[PDB]
């Protein structure tokens, strides 16, 4: 198997490694066709997350089924599939509550031993446990390059917005115009937002945000809070989706949002805490949610939207590279020279 592996902080290389085999009756093996590099993968790259050298990286994929365990009914070898970046068992108390992101046997592909110790997706073959839970057949008229987003960054943004109770007419602020933010912007549009505001600090990304229908706001060059408020009757938006990570942007989200509004925090960060407004919080009536995506809950709806053309996430792909050029990909994406990198696996 050709596969991208971690070597040390900020180093990554493509080596020969063993192809995995079926080990459980609900396993499936997937011949990966495309594999993404995610913002989350940068936390690995920068040693923010513990990984052993020689571990296969990546949790974004689309491909075809090679084989299935004796327990799998609805998947055969030909089948084009996509799956959530995180796995779930389907029988623990959290899975029964449909909170698959809190699965007791939960994990994330290619994210090291603190997250299930799973071999990653940037490779020719992927073992998917409990494939009955963790995979979806592609609808017949859907390109793999579109479908791949359903497994991670699109369902993340979608989920953020549904949990944030976005209703038609609502105004929305999105903090972070990276890939996740850009998914959020597009989705917010199709869910009938009356106005969408994108806050970032990189013109290339703000330009992209604007093309998707948002009012761009450079946080380096102005006070985003003052600006967001004037755009929203001096109240603030009904919903804020924060997609950066960290106390700076979270406090921003909480200041920015209107009284009685909702903040949906979706960005990752290491800080153990941040200051949540109390006295002012009581006056303002805030609803706040923070968490990792629960992709399984949303993936079927996201796929139906992709298949029908309502969403076109692949437009944000700046680079399709061969698997062997992965280390360049990581450098590009890290240095913010690529917007989204997709790896073609031969």
Chain centroid, CA 308 distance in Å: 21
- Strands 125-128 and 195-200: what pairing? unpaired
Q: Is 59 annotated as a binding residue?
A: yes
Residue 285 neighbours by CB under 8 Å, 6+ apart: 259, 260
Considering the rule CB under 5 A, would residue 89 count as an interface residue with Zn ion? yes
Structure tokens at 179: 């890939």
Question: Interface with a second copy includes 230 (CB under 8 A)?
Answer: no
- The DSSP secondary structure of 312-325, one letter per residue, reads -GGGG--EEEEGGG
Q: How far apart are CA 93 and CA 109, in angstroms?
A: 22
- 264 binds ligand NAD, rule: CB under 6 A: no
For the chain, how far is it from start to end, CA to CA, in angstroms? 11
DSSP label at residue 123: B
Q: Is 269 annotated as a binding residue?
A: no
Which of 22, 191, 215, 248 is in the footprint of ligand NAD by CB under 6 A?
248
CA dist., res. 30 & res. 47, Å (int): 28
Q: Which member of 11, 260, 301, 304 binds a second copy (CB under 8 A)?
A: 260
- By CB under 8 A, is residue 268 in contact with a second copy? yes
344 binds a second copy (CB under 8 A): no
Closest to Zn ion by CB, 219 or 332: 332
Whether residue 200 is annotated as binding a ligand: the answer is yes
Residues 113-172 interacting with ligand NAD (rule: CB under 6 A): 152-153, 156
Q: HEC string of 158-170?
A: HHHHHHCCCCCCC
With binding defined as CB under 5 A, does residue 184 bind Zn ion?
Answer: no
In this structure, are residues 3 and 109 in contact, taking their beta carbons and an 8 Å threshold? no
Told to check if 198 binds ligand NAD by CB under 6 A, we report no
Q: Which stretch binds ligand NAD (CB under 6 A): 72-80, 122-130, 243-251, 310-318?
A: 243-251
| 235 lies in the binding site for a second copy (CB under 8 A) | yes
Closest C-alpha to 345, from 33, 134, 29: 33
Q: Which stretch binds ligand NAD (CB under 6 A): 17-25, 34-42, 138-146, 255-263?
A: 34-42
Compute φ and ψ for 185, nearest 5 degrees.
-55, -55
Element (H, E) at 153: helix 153-163
Position 290 contacts a second copy (CB under 8 A) = yes
Q: Which residue lies nearer to ligand NAD by CB, 112 or 181?
A: 181
* Residue 141 touching a second copy (CB under 8 A): no
Does position 102 bind a second copy by CB under 8 A?
A: yes
Annotated ligand binding at 263? The verdict is: no
Question: Does the protein bind a second copy through residue 281 (CB under 8 A)?
Answer: yes
Separation between Cα atoms, residue 55 and residue 39, nearest integer Å: 18
Residue 42 interacting entry, from Zn ion, a second copy, ligand NAD, none, C-beta within 5 to 8 Å by type: ligand NAD
Neighbouring C-alpha atoms within 13 Å toward the C-beta of 98: 4
What span, in angstroms and rounded, lies between the C-alpha atoms of 111 and 118?
Answer: 7
Chosen residue from 219, 257, 299, 311 binding ligand NAD by CB under 6 A: 219
Q: Per-residue contact track with Zn ion, 147 to 166, x per CB under 5 A?
A: -----x--------------
The residues facing 264 across adjacent strands are: 241, 289
Binding-site residues sit at 38-39, 59, 89, 92, 95, 103, 152, 180, 200, 205, 244, 266, 268, 291, 293
What is the binding site for ligand NAD (CB under 6 A)? Answer: 38-40, 42-43, 152-153, 156, 176-181, 199-202, 205, 219, 243-245, 248-249, 266-268, 292-293
Binding-site residues for Zn(2+) sit at 38, 59, 89, 92, 95, 103, 152
């Amino acid at each position: 198997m050709r596969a991208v592996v971690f070597e040390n902080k900020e180093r990554v290389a493509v080596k020969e490694v063993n192809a995995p085999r079926l080990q459980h009756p609900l396993d499936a093996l997937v011949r990966v066709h495309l594999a993404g590099i995610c913002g989350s993968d940068l936390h690995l790259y920068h040693g923010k997350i513990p990984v052993l050298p020689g571990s296969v990286l990546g949790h974004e994929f689309v491909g075809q089924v090679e084989a299935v365990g004796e327990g799998i009914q609805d998947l055969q070898p030909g089948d084009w599939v996509v799956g959530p970046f995180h796995i779930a068992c389907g029988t623990c108390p959290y899975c029964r509550r449909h909170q698959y992101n809190l699965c007791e046997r939960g994990g994330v592909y290619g994210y090291g031993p603190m997250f299930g110790n799973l071999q990653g997706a940037q490779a020719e073959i992927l073992r998917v446990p409990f494939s009955n839970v963790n995979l979806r057949k592609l609808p017949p008229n859907l390109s793999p390059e579109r479908a791949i987003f359903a497994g991670d960054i699109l369902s993340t943004a979608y989920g953020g917005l549904i949990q944030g109770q976005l209703r038609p007419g609502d105004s929305v602020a999105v903090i972070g115009a990276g890939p996740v933010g850009l998914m959020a912007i597009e989705v917010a549009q199709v869910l009938g937002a009356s106005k969408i505001l994108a806050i970032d600090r990189i013109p290339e990304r703000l330009e992209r945000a604007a093309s998707l229908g948002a009012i761009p706001i450079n946080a380096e060059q102005e006070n985003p809070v003052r600006r967001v408020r004037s755009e929203t009757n001096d109240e603030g938006p009904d919903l804020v989706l924060e997609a950066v990570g960290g106390a700076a942007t979270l406090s921003l989200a909480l200041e920015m949002v209107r009284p009685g509004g909702r903040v949906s925090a979706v960005g990752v960060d290491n800080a153990p805490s941040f200051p949540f407004p109390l006295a002012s919080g009581l006056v303002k009536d805030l609803t706040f949610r923070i968490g990792l995506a629960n992709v399984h809950l949303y993936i079927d709806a996201v796929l139906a939207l992709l298949a029908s053309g309502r969403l076109q996430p692949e437009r944000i792909v700046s680079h399709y590279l061969p698997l062997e050029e992965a280390p360049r990909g990581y450098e590009l994406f890290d240095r913010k020279e690529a917007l989204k990198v997709l790896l073609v696996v031969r």
